[PDB]
Ligand binder design. Structure first.
Ligand SMILES: [Ca+2]
Ligand SMILES: [Ca+2]
Length: 124
């Protein structure tokens, strides 16, 4: 309860959060203060997505790692499928292909972290 306390305060005073959002980070950092640095980062991104670039990239990396299970810095068509069918969805292997193709810049059949970034940026 030393650097925890700091983050706590900082979240309290992040201007742009609404008080439902504020409340979320707060009581959740109470139940698990070991997670202090991570909740601050997420809120920092939530509050100013332009100003909190590193914190957004931070969180977005962990999102990447979720699909990129073998960790070769790339999301294959298979890894997409592997993740999705684990979520009870049943895609035809032709939609998995259309889903990668729809966010693939250099058109090499997979998805790199920069391409991943663009997709996130796009909606919103
Ligand atoms: Ca991979
Ligand atoms: Ca690519």
């Amino acid at each position: 309860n030393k650097e925890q306390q700091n983050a706590f305060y900082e979240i309290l005073h992040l201007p742009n959060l609404n008080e439902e959002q504020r409340n979320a980070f707060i009581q959740s950092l109470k139940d698990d203060p070991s997670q202090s640095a991570n909740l601050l980062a997420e809120a920092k991104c939530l509050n100013d997505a332009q100003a909190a670039a590193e914190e957004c990239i931070a969180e977005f990396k962990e999102a990447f790692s979720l699909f990129d299970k073998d960790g070769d810095g790339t999301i294959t068509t298979k890894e997409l499928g592997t993740v999705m069918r684990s979520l009870g969805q049943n895609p035809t292997e032709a939609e998995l292909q259309d889903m990668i193709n729809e966010v693939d810049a250099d058109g090499n059949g997979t998805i790199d972290f920069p391409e991943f970034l663009t997709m996130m940026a796009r909606k919103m």
